[PDB]
Amino acid sequence: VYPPVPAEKRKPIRVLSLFDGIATGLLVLKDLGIQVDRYIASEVCEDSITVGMVRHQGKIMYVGDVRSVTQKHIQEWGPFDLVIGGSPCNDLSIVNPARKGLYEGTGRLFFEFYRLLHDARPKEGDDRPFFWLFENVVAMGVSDKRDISRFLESNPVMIDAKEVSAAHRARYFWGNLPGMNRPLASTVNDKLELQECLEHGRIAKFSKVRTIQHFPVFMNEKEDILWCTEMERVFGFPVHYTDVSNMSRLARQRLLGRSWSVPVIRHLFAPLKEYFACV
Amino acid sequence: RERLVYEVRQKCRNIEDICISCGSLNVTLEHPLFVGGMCQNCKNCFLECAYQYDDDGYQSYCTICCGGREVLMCGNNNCCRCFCVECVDLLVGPGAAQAAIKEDPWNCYMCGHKGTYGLLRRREDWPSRLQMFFANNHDQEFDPPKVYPPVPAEKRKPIRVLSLFDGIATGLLVLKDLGIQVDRYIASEVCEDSITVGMVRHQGKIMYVGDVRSVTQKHIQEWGPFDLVIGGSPCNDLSIVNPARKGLYEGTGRLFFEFYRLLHDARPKEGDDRPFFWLFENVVAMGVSDKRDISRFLESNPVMIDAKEVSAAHRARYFWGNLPGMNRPLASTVNDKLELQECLEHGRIAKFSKVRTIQHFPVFMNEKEDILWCTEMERVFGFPVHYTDVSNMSRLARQRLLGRSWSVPVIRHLFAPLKEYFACV
Ligand SMILES: Nc1ncnc2c1ncn2[C@@H]1O[C@H](CSCC[C@H](N)C(=O)O)[C@@H](O)[C@H]1O
Ligand SMILES: Nc1ncnc2c1ncn2[C@@H]1O[C@H](CSCC[C@H](N)C(=O)O)[C@@H](O)[C@H]1O
Ligand SMILES: [Zn+2]
Ligand SMILES: [Zn+2]
Ligand SMILES: [Zn+2]
């Protein structure tokens, strides 16, 4: 536990964000009104790059693959105040029909986070505030979870988004952010019922959508999928967030599906306001 | 015309006494863009052909004669004109076309910086003459539309609209933007995506009908008196942009009459002097006898309105109707974006200032050639941001859906004096 820095002394936060996806982290930091000095992001999927580019207005400095980031890169891109990331979950999740393996691909990429975390960490005796967050799914192996806990040298917190959002999104969060254990509060802006997240003219038999009776909606006495803008509303994203480039619906749903739940991430990132500068 | 222009350059015949399109001696008009006379058959050809563009975004035929077998496309940015080899042999000289092919950065004669050549010289008020040229269509003489006296403000009531070929509910959207109270908005449409767009964006208010051909006069009577009937025939088959142009009169022409029928069904009787208004829309790249038959049946003179005046698209459209002030000039408000660049997303730069939609991919982003994004196509046509992102549809379909639609500030311009006849929010 690092002691709080006085308000006049606070500075803009610097974030290294691995497996950034659609820039949920920076978006949440903006929503909290924290000044962001810089936001370095590694990602490989072009659609997600584009989403971040447009929605965050060129501010994000885009890097390539995480495996091309050296310790020299970490040093020359300035000291980092917050390192965040979530390993690929599509291969760990049981939803993908082609489950060739779980430890392959995703597990290797985990260590990449691990490496860069140590690269971004201040030395002992440098008592400057430094924070990190790793995210993963709950449907994972026990020895896998143990090895992750061993390497990050911490105990996981399971947080389920149902407490604050209209999705069943149970996720592990390792990290040293203050108040990562405390209970989740749902603000009035958050929508605990699926029906509030639907478009007008639609009615939901479901109150929650399970995403980690396939088609959740009865509209005009017919069974339909949630629309992309509603999937955004379920996860807490701003309205029409992923409509940037010309991409197919299947891809755009997939893109939204991988992402972090916005009010959960707001809940986690909120006490960082006590350590950095405000807008 | 080779021997006749031989006598023209020998100072024995005036170029203004000869039809520079086909060499006819039956000179009635002057050519609107360049020096010479113009015969009536060439006027009909010019009406059909001038604003016809190929799939490359350049003109389908020569700009001069509206024919030509092999054409010269123009190098200058945003210019889409073509000049066939035959025309250049008279006006610039023999072999000038074959020599002009070899000039790799070439500018066409509407874009030439000098503006003055030997036999061909560009006439100075050509945009004014282009605007006058449609007023020059007095062959289809018709009586002026009946002007209805303004209803006092306290007496005004909410407008009722019958909207055929509604598409994505551009009309109701514009009426909302003008702040006119809408009692009801009956709409016929058949494409499910467009139905959905209207449903969501206009919040269940729209009462959806099926095919226009299932709407009877009894239907028209029992759905209450209508104050405004609007519509635009399918333009995809009339447009030269669709590769599969099987016909022009088939499909689209038949559906035109549907509008015609329901218009008469919705019209008040003589002696019923209640205000009533109607609008029909169509493309400029259409047949002359087609345009005549349309003018004959709607018993009116078309107004051509080009969206370039108020928006970032070349969208030249005919508007028949009796709305007051349909002839008056178009004003572009500060909210409207006359440059393509203002309509782009951040991080993108447009070499183009206008997009021609009636160098295929209009955008240089990160030193690469890309299509406009769907939300930008919405911004080009004046639609609200993220207007067509309702259901889960493909990009090709969603672009197509946007492409057919009416230009929003043009429709705002047309619908604006209806505020003097109906109730406000
Ligand atoms: N080698 C690699 N380097 C960086 N990102 C990668 C990668 N391989 C896969 N990814 C990306 O890692 C992401 C994992 S899920 C990302 C969730 C993210 N927090 C969000 O809010 O969207 C995927 O988007 C995938 O595109
Ligand atoms: N039989 C029919 N009845 C009603 N609409 C039809 C039809 N056949 C085709 N259409 C529709 O007519 C439209 C012509 S273009 C529509 C433009 C409209 N003003 C807009 O703003 O979108 C197309 O959307 C097409 O889907
Ligand atoms: Zn002629
Ligand atoms: Zn020609
Ligand atoms: Zn030119």
Instruction: Write the secondary structure of chain B as one string of H (helix), E (strand) and C (coil).
Output: CHHHHHHHHCCCCCHHHCECCCCCCCCCEECCCECCEECHHHHHHHHHHCCCECCCCCECCCCCCCCCCCEEECCCCCCCCEEEHHHHHHHCCCCHHHHHHCCCCCCCCCCCCCCECCCCEECCCHHHHHHHHHHCCCCCCCCCCCCCCCCCHHHCCCEEEEEECCCCCHHHHHHHHCCECEEEEEEECCCHHHHHHHHHHCCCCCEEECCHHHCCHHHHHHCCCCCEEEEECCCCCCCCCCCCCCCCCCCHHHHHHHHHHHHHHHCCCCCCCCCCEEEEEEECCCCHHHHHHHHHHHCCCCEEEEHHHCCCEECEEEEEECCCCCCCCCCCCCCCCCCCHHHCCCCCECCCCCEECCCCCCEEECCEEECCCHHHHHHHHCCCCCCCCCCCCCHHHHHHHHHCCCCHHHHHHHHHHHHHCCCEC
Phi, psi angles (nearest 5°) of residue A38: -160, 160
Q: Which residue of A18, A26, A39, A44 sits with most ligand 1 atoms within 8 Å of its CB, as the best mutation to test the pocket?
A: A44
Cβ atoms of residues A103 and A35 within 8 Å: no
The resolution, in Å, is: 3.6
Method by which the model was determined: cryo-EM
- Here the tokens at position B275 are 């205000």
Q: Spell out where chain A is interrupted, by the residue before each break (C to N > 2.5 A).
A: 212
For residue A229, the chain B residues in CB contact (below 8 A) are 389-390
Is A220 in the B-facing interface, judged by CB distances under 8 Å?
A: no
d(CA B21, CA B64) in angstroms, rounded, equals 6
* DSSP assigned state of A186: -
Residues with CB under 6 A from ligand 1: A 19, 21-22, 24, 42-45, 48, 65-66, 86, 88-89, 109, 258-260
Q: Measured over all CA atoms, what is the biggest interatomic distance in chain A, rounded to whole angstroms?
A: 66
At residue B197's C-alpha, the angle toward residues B416 and B309, to 5°, is 35
d(CA A142, CA A148) in angstroms, rounded, equals 10
* Residue to substitute from B199, B201, B206, B389, interface A, most A β-carbons within 10 A: B389
Identity of residue B78? N
List the one residue out of A253, A239, A257 whose CA is nearest residue A189: A239
Nearest to B345 among A54, A239, A240 (CB): A54
d(CA B294, CA B257) in angstroms, rounded, equals 9
- C-alpha distances out from residue A158 to A152, A163, A165, B213, Å: 15, 12, 15, 60
Phi, psi angles (nearest 5°) of residue A45: -85, 120
Is B130 in the A-facing interface, judged by CB distances under 8 Å?
A: no
d(CA A253, CA A226) in angstroms, rounded, equals 9
CA-derived radius of gyration, chain B = 23
Identity of residue A240? H
List the one residue out of B168, B165, B164, B161 whose CA is nearest residue B202: B168
* Residue to substitute from A243, A252, A255, interface B, most B β-carbons within 10 A: A243
B39 classed as catalytic: no
Identity of residue B198? G
**Is the backbone of residue A86 left (phi > 0), alpha (psi -120 to 50) or beta?**
beta
Residue B418: Cβ-neighbour burial (10 angstroms; 0-12, 13-18, 19+) = buried
Q: Spell out where chain B is interrupted, by the residue before each break (C to N > 2.5 A).
A: 358
Strands, DSSP E only, in A57-178? 61-63, 82-86, 131-137, 157-160, 167-168, 170-175
Is B391 in the A-facing interface, judged by CB distances under 8 Å?
A: yes
| Ligand 1 atom 21, closest CA | A259
Give strand pairing partners of B314.
B356
For residue A46, the chain B residues in CB contact (below 8 A) are none
Cβ atoms of residues A15 and A29 within 8 Å: yes
